[PDB]
Design a protein around this ligand. Structure first.
Ligand code: SF4
Ligand code: SF4
Ligand code: F3S
Ligand SMILES: [Cl-]
Ligand SMILES: [Cl-]
Ligand SMILES: [Cl-]
Ligand SMILES: [Mg+2]
Lengths: 599, 269
């Protein structure tokens, strides 16, 4: 047992293993210890995959890198491509044209929406929603619930909910439950009434059908989804508004994109945000405010979405770092500073010359070292209980000035809130969303459902699994709104006569400096993403990625400090220690992408 | 009534799973609820840990030699196989265990089919395609990074309707989807035939939709349905949106030189 970051870690209790962790991207193992009352008193995050993209990139052409690193992940598809082209452009002093900037922003915001909405419904919702309970719901009461939760959503009649309920029923009555087989249905950890469950399941089905439409924006600009194409110096989708049909982008293609954006805005406003507000309210009323972890103290994002390109002071999700829960002081974060972002491997399956220090990613090293500690139960190829006192993950341990940080939509919303309080006007919309959301959760939704009003502040409500889930939904809404404005600006710029989509001045490596280094950052769906590159004689000398889930899923560092996943699980009661309902609910609130975390 | 699919994930990016759920005809929703029984799939399944693992035994017993094994990604042979760990054991052990009683095996995507990005030089994990590990079962390769959504569901639909694997080419790919090179029906072909090429990004030729051969387009050597079926319900494909094909359905495309290096012997095509 030891204490770190205010958490009292104790591994003397009953050990519980969750392997595989499902409804995530990629491969994770989680172990916890619980005390005599089933409260988690230790948590262990193990990334269970590695591919070695950083090693594979050595010696290749920087112009090709984006395509390799894009394949780090098909869920956050394109965010790595964006970081890569930014990193190469930074290294080579390349400024992309305005239309390329706007198209990339629209693609990024499209990914945010798609990734957030699919995550919540198809990966997260079954931690909050009991599908078998939905079978017992009254269709009439479900219709009435729907009208209170989201008055503007047109799909609200009793017959519509009866139809969905019956298909679900027939499916279950078949005896082949598919994705619902061996679920934790009926657990007391589930608190929603049947009507709320049926509403949510119905939206799970609606979103599965709709998500395929949103990504057609990627298809227009990048050819395909998953894995749309990017380009060092701009975008490949050349513009000819007028032989119009022969160019990748003409007015009709832009109108198509706008139609998809308008649909996105509708879905976020009428389905996604209201569902999360309603589910959050009900779990809040049940007292389930666990899972805050490091969000209560330390949060980080690089900052993103400048309304003036290459001017970070105009970031619409302004970033930086908060420490010790002091929301009155946002420290600037510089990805170029060797003393800020650093990665440790003390408890990771890698080796450094000296593992008592952290390496900034321009000096990063990726040499595998799969070895298990002396207190392991089982063998090298058959682990029963992992030894977290030694090396226990394929995930490296990123820290900021040595501090363990949480990253993600929640981090960005806390930072935006802090920025807005300090007088930053670019953060006014997220501040508004948060204040609106607090009032809905505390007062409006309780009043409408006949529940008592509460008086939680944002500082109390946000650092929690509920809060983490809420911030994701709000971010989706904000990204939809922002890309709606980006579309107008793109169309306006083209109509003014600027059709440029690529700067090719430094496309040929004969124009390059013989060595260079660059960094590209992105506010990826799961948090702060960076790619750091060194170029030598036209080739990649080093390429290091530090990815959002690398931060959140980090194992312990040299100092034994715990990362976001491990901290978030601490001090959480489990209804039944052999059913990981609460572990899954909190882990999933981070939207873990394990392929990302390890690359 | 509904054929079980056990969908396993090795070393992968999850792009093949994502592509699958973009299918419009049929809807993935209808595939899951009405066509297959998707009984194991890490991305979507309610059960985790011991409860998830327990499903594999149950389905394999009850539906012995009558389930489809679908594989996204691949097994690593380095690090004693523990660069991909499932249930504290190497992924290759799960793959071999589930494969032995499968009616048919689908290798989804370039990773499962050929090695994928992780198998590109120097292949630190010795990632190995499914057919080099499972040598005694019928395997259909559905390559692409990822494959087109409707190609993935088209394979499932054929297999469910006929209870047969569709006719395959020498490389194990379905002829109904992989018989044509991209270049055969690519709408920019008349430009290629007229020697009309893009030479620099966003030049006048690019704005007129000229052929992308000189920008590295690998369409002339790449077999897929992209130029006809196209992507995301026929919305576009790489070439229509202005980037050359990078050859993503072809074996070892990652190590066939820069994506922007043109093919040589233009007379060939
Ligand atoms: S083929 Fe491509 S898209 Fe599919 S699971 Fe491999 S890297 Fe990802
Ligand atoms: S080289 Fe590429 S762009 Fe040109 S016609 Fe062939 S497939 Fe189309
Ligand atoms: S890159 Fe791949 S998606 Fe089709 S156009 Fe070429 S085979
Ligand atoms: Cl950019
Ligand atoms: Cl390959
Ligand atoms: Cl070749
Ligand atoms: Mg890294």
């Amino acid at each position: 047992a030891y204490a770190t970051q205010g958490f009292n870690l104790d591994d003397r209790g009953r050990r519980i293993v969750v392997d595989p962790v499902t409804r995530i991207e990629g491969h994770m193992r989680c172990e916890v210890n619980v005390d005599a009352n089933n409260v988690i008193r230790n948590a262990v995050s193990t990334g269970t995959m590695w591919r070695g993209l950083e090693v594979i990139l050595k010696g290749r052409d920087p112009r090709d890198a984006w395509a390799f690193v894009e394949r780090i992940c098909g869920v956050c598809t394109g965010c790595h491509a964006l970081a890569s082209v930014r990193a190469v452009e930074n290294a080579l002093d390349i400024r992309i044209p305005k239309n390329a900037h706007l198209i990339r922003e629209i693609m990024a915001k499209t990914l945010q929406v798609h990734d957030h909405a699919v995550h919540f419904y198809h990966l997260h919702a079954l931690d909050w929603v009991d599908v078998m309970s939905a079978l017992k719901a009254d269709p009439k009461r479900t219709s009435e619930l729907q009208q209170l939760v989201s008055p503007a959503h047109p799909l609200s009649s009793a017959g519509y909910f009866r139809d969905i309920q019956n298909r679900l029923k027939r499916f279950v009555e078949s005896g082949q439950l598919g994705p619902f087989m061996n679920g934790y249905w009926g657990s007391k950890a589930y608190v929603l009434p049947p009507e709320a469950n049926l509403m949510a399941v119905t939206h799970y089905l609606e979103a599965l059908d709709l998500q395929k439409e949103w990504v057609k924006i990627h298809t227009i600009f990048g050819g395909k989804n998953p894995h749309p194409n990017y380009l060092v110096g701009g975008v490949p989708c050349a513009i000819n508004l007028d032989g119009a049909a022969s160019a990748p982008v003409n007015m009709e293609r832009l109108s198509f994109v706008k139609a998809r954006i308008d649909e996105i805005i509708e879905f976020n406003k009428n389905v996604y945000v209201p569902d999360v507000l309603a589910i959050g309210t009900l779990y809040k009323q049940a007292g389930w405010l666990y899972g805050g972890g490091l969000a209560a103290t330390n949060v980080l994002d690089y900052g993103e979405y400048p309304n003036v390109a290459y001017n970070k002071s105009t970031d619409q999700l302004p970033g930086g770092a908060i420490l010790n829960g002091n929301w009155d002081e946002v420290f600037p974060v510089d990805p170029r500073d060797s003393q800020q972002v650093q990665e440790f491997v003390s408890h990771s399956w890698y080796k450094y010359a000296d593992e008592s220090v952290g390496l900034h990613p321009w000096d990063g090293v990726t040499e595998p070292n799969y070895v298990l500690g002396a207190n392991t139960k089982g063998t090298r190829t058959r682990i029963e209980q992992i030894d977290e006192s030694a090396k226990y993950s394929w995930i490296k341990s990123p820290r900021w000035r040595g501090h363990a940080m949480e990253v993600g939509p929640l981090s960005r919303y806390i930072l935006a809130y802090a920025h807005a309080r300090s007088g930053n006007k670019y953060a006014e919309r997220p501040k508004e969303q948060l204040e609106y959301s607090a009032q809905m959760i505390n007062s409006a939704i309780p009043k409408a459902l006949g529940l008592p009003e509460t008086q939680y502040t944002l500082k109390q409500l946000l650092p929690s699994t509920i809060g983490r889930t809420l911030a994701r939904a709000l971010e989706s809404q904000y990204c939809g709104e922002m890309m709606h404005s980006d579309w107008h600006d793109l169309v306006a710029n083209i109509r003014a006569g600027d059709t440029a989509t690529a700067n090719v001045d430094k496309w040929d490596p004969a124009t390059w400096p013989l060595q260079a280094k660059g960094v590209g950052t992105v506010a990826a769906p799961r948090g702060a993403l960076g790619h750091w590159i060194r170029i030598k004689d036209g080739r990649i000398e080093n390429y290091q990625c530090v990815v959002p889930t690398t931060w959140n899923g980090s194992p312990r560092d040299y100092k034994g400090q715990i990362g976001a996943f491990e901290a978030s699980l601490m001090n959480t009661p489990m209804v039944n220690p052999e059913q990981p309902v609460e572990i899954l609910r909190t882990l999933h609130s981070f939207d873990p992408c394990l392929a990302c975390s390890t690359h | 009534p509904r054929t079980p699919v056990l969908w396993l994930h090795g070393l992968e990016c999850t792009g093949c799973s994502e592509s699958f759920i973009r299918s419009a005809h049929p809807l993935a929703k209808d595939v899951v609820l009405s066509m297959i029984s998707l009984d194991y799939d890490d991305t979507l399944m309610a059960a985790a840990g011991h409860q998830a693992e327990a499903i594999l035994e149950e389905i394999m017993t009850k539906y012995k030699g009558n389930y489809i094994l679908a594989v996204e990604g691949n097994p690593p042979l380095n690090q004693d196989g523990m660069s991909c760990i499932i249930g504290g054991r190497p992924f290759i052990e799960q793959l071999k265990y589930v494969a032995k009683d499968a009616k048919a095996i689908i290798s989804w995507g370039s990773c499962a089919s050929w090695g994928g990005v992780q198998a590109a030089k120097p292949n630190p994990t010795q990632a190995t395609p499914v057919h080099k590990v499972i040598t005694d079962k019928p395997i259909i390769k559905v390559p692409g990074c990822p494959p087109i959504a409707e190609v993935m569901t088209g394979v499932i639909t054929y297999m469910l309707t006929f209870d047969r694997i569709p006719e395959l080419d020498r490389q194990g790919r379905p002829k109904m989807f992989y018989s044509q090179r991209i270049h055969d029906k690519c709408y920019r072909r008349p430009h290629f035939d007229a020697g009309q090429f893009v030479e620099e990004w966003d030049d006048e030729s690019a704005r007129k939709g000229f052929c992308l051969y000189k920008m590295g387009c690998k369409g002339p050597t790449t077999y897929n349905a992209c130029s006809t079926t196209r992507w995301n319900e026929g919305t576009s494909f790489p070439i229509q949106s202005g980037h050359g094909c990078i050859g993503c359905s072809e074996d070892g495309f990652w190590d066939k030189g820069s994506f922007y290096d043109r093919l040589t012997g233009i007379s060939q095509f």
